[PDB]
Each structure stands twice: as C-alpha cells, then as structure tokens.
Design a binder for this molecule. Structure first.
Ligand SMILES: [Cl-]
Ligand SMILES: [Cl-]
Lengths: 202, 245
C-alpha cells in the first residue's frame, strides 16, 4: 500500500554534465534505499544503496542522499559518461529486498560530446540480395534531432552513437532506407533539420 | 552472477515451457520478477532456503519450482498474450553472516505470447558495404546491417569479424522500427552500424558477418501454412574487404 515517487521520468544531459534523480516515499518505517541501473537488454544492477541512519553516501561519480524527515532521497551522477545511459529505479523497503517498493523509473540518456562534427549523408553500396537503397546520416553534432519519415515506404531509424574505442572516437549516425523508385539521399531526411553545412557527395 | 535460460521465448497459448535460473553464490534467497516495458520489476515469487515464502497473487499458470539450493525454475503453460514480459530471476542473502547483503539479477527471459503463430516471420538480413565518399572524406568506413520483415521482435544481432564477435564501432538500434505502424501485426525492422578504419575495410582478407538470431517456433508447434515453418533460426549476411579501384 506504499509508494515511491520517481522524478523525472526522462532525463537527457550532455557528457560532462551532472544528473540528479529525486524520489519520495510514503512508508515512514522504510530503512533501506537501493538504486538499480538497467541497461538495454540486461537485468537491473544494484549500483548504490543507503542503509539509513545517515544522510549521504558517495562512491566515485555516484552519490545518494536521504532525508527521513522529508522522506526524500536522491541520486547524483557527476561527470556523466555515455555508458551511464540507462533506466534508473529507486526503491524503499523496510524488510529487505522482499518488500522493496519501486520508483517508476527514469530514462537517463547521456549524449556524447562530438569533438569535430562532420555532418554528411552517404549512399551505401547496394546488396546483391536486397532491393533496398540505404542512406547514412553520420558524424553530426548532438544538438541535431532526426525526425521520422513522412513517407510510408521510407524507413528512418533514430539517432545512434558508436564508440570506436581504440581511437577515442564517438560518432552519431542515422539510417534511412526504401525500395520505392522516387528515393535518393538528398531528400531522405528532408522531414528533419540537418545542419546547414551537411555534406552531400555524388 | 545469476544465469537464465532461455534468453528469448516465443509461445502459443497451448505450449508449455520451463524457465531456468542458476546462481552459485550460495544465496539462500531467490526471486522471480516480471517486468513489463517502461515499468519497474514486479515481484512474483521469493524462495527462502528452498521453501516458498512469498507468492504475490501469481496466477497458477506460472508454476514455480526450486529443486535445490542453487537452482530455480518457472514452468509456463496455458499462457495469455498479456503475459508477454521480461521474466527476471534474482538472488540474495549470502550464507549466514559471512558476507554483506546485496541482490543480483539474471538477464531475464524475454517472453512473447501470441494468439496465432500464423504471423511469426523470420527476418531477412542484408549487409550494405561502405560509401567510398565516406572512405575518402573521413578515412572511416561504415557498414549497415538491415534485418527486416520479422515478427515478433525477438532478435539478437551481432557482428563477427574474421570469426570473432566484435563490439567496438557497433551501434544497434535500441528499438525495432514498425514496418506498418498502424497495424497491430506489423513486422519489424532493425538497423545496425559497424564502423572501421578505411585501412581495415580496404583489406580484402577481412571478413564481416552480420548475424541475427531469431527466436520463433519450436518443433513442438504445429504448422499448416504452405510457406516455410518459421522456426527459431539464425540469418546472416556477409561482406568482405574491397581494395581500391
Ligand atoms: Cl502437453
Ligand atoms: Cl571488441
């Protein structure tokens, strides 16, 4: 019959920023406050907890605060890294994990800082087994948002970031593809706002 | 670490299947949770020293079992489509003082229950070789892998270079695109990129396999359609390094 209120339900920051998640809880006798981090495709992982009596715990970039009199508790990430992107769940219990009450979750996205933005769109090589033509919008700044296609047989995926670890190089991309005849690269992302200086080769 | 099998599961409404969960950390408490999308985990069962102690109004069609100290099962039958969920196993309570407390989750079985298996479709998979204009503008090369036409959205996509799975330079869509967004029975589509140095792609000895593991019907499922029975299977597309023209 108890609740834990998690705010905000969505949080998006730039790599380097801090991020804070505020929870409240209704059960006065709660004495254990874990925090779970669930990355896409994985189970939740318990990252920090505050077993009460005290107001603060710090573990490197992760820190939690608890105020039993207000029944607030908080999670603070400093120096966010993109691998902090996940759903975070706060929880409060009085009797261990058996009686955890769970926050509704916060989706943290940390977009990476793009060192040298190089906005361009490329026509990918055709595949002997596909009728599709594939267009790659890559190397754009993170302040750019990719809308979906207003065409029925034009498929546009959302922004995605890959990390070429060995050269410390992160990179945004988005993909459009279609089999329809009236489809080339210069118009795939028209329903989006590419920067003014995006490169279109031939 | 807690292990779970299988990773993904597709079921009709009259199949029976068992979920397996293992921990060897000596934990005296084991948990089954159900997680629906964009929702926190919901507790179903808790075992304590292999005796069941918590059952949170779980319908009988989820029938649990704890054969020994380190293993926990969940048997499924006569399921319903609203039972589609992520089923999470967990463990806690190390042996009797000697070890601080914490709680560990397995990776969960991703389960989809469908009314009619008529709509199951394995993906088509295709690989698209890099743009030469990208190769010369940036000295990098991006391959794209498209998995399309599959249903339901139980796919694991991986890249293999020279026989070994790779992770650096990879981005796979967090979510599958709906190919007919209006329809309920829409087959899905999934994009992935693999990005490498221009030098690496121009070497024709380098081998790139895009591999999609599709979870579909088992042998136990009846199939009367003329077309090929959409069993669980792997679908790959390949590509090799292309030298300068
Ligand atoms: Cl049977
Ligand atoms: Cl790797």
């Amino acid at each position: 019959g108890e609740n834990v209120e998690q705010h905000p339900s969505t949080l998006s920051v730039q790599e380097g920023d801090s991020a804070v998640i505020k929870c409240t809880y209704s059960d006065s006798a709660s004495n254990y406050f874990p925090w779970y981090k669930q990355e896409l495709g994985k189970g939740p992982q318990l990252i920090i907890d505050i077993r009460s009596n005290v107001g603060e715990k710090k573990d490197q970039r992760i820190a939690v605060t608890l105020n039993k009199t207000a029944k607030h508790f908080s999670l603070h990430i400093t120096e966010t890294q993109p691998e902090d992107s996940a759903v975070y769940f706060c929880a409060a219990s009085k009797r261990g994990f058996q009686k955890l009450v769970f926050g509704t979750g916060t989706r943290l996205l940390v977009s990476p800082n793009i060192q040298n933005p190089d906005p361009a769109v490329y026509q990918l090589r055709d595949s002997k087994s596909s009728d599709k033509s594939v267009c790659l919008f890559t190397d754009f700044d993170s302040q750019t948002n990719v809308s979906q296609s207003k065409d029925s047989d034009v498929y546009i995926t959302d922004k995605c970031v890959l990390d070429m670890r060995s050269m410390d190089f992160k990179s945004n991309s988005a993909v459009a593809w279609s089999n329809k005849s009236d489809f080339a690269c210069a118009n795939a992302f028209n329903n989006s706002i590419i920067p003014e200086d995006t490169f279109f080769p031939s | 670490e807690v292990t779970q099998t299988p990773k993904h599961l597709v079921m009709g409404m009259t199949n029976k299947k068992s979920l397996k969960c293992e921990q060897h950390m000596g934990h005296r408490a084991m948990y089954w949770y159900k997680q629906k999308a964009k929702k926190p985990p919901e507790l179903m069962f808790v075992y304590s020293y292999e005796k069941l102690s918590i059952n949170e109004s779980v319908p009988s069609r989820f029938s649990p079992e704890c054969p020994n100290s380190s293993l926990l099962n969940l048997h499924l039958h006569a399921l319903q489509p609203e039972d589609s969920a992520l089923y999470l196993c967990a463990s806690s309570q190390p042996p009797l003082g000697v070890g601080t407390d914490t709680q560990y989750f397995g990776p969960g079985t991703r389960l989809t229950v469908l009314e009619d298996l008529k709509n199951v479709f394995p993906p088509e998979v295709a690989v698209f070789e890099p743009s030469e204009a990208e190769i010369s503008h940036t000295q990098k090369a991006t391959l794209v892998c498209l998995a399309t036409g599959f249903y339901p959205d139980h796919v694991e996509l991986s890249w293999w270079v020279n026989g070994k799975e790779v992770h650096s330079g990879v981005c796979t869509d967090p979510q599958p695109l709906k190919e007919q967004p209006a329809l309920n029975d829409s087959r899905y589509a999934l994009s992935s990129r693999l990005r490498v140095s221009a030098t690496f792609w121009q070497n024709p000895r380098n081998h790139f396999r895009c591999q999609v593991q599709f979870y579909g019907l088992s042998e136990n499922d009846e199939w009367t359609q003329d077309r090929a029975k959409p069993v669980t299977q792997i679908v790959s597309a390949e590509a090799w390094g292309r030298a300068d023209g």
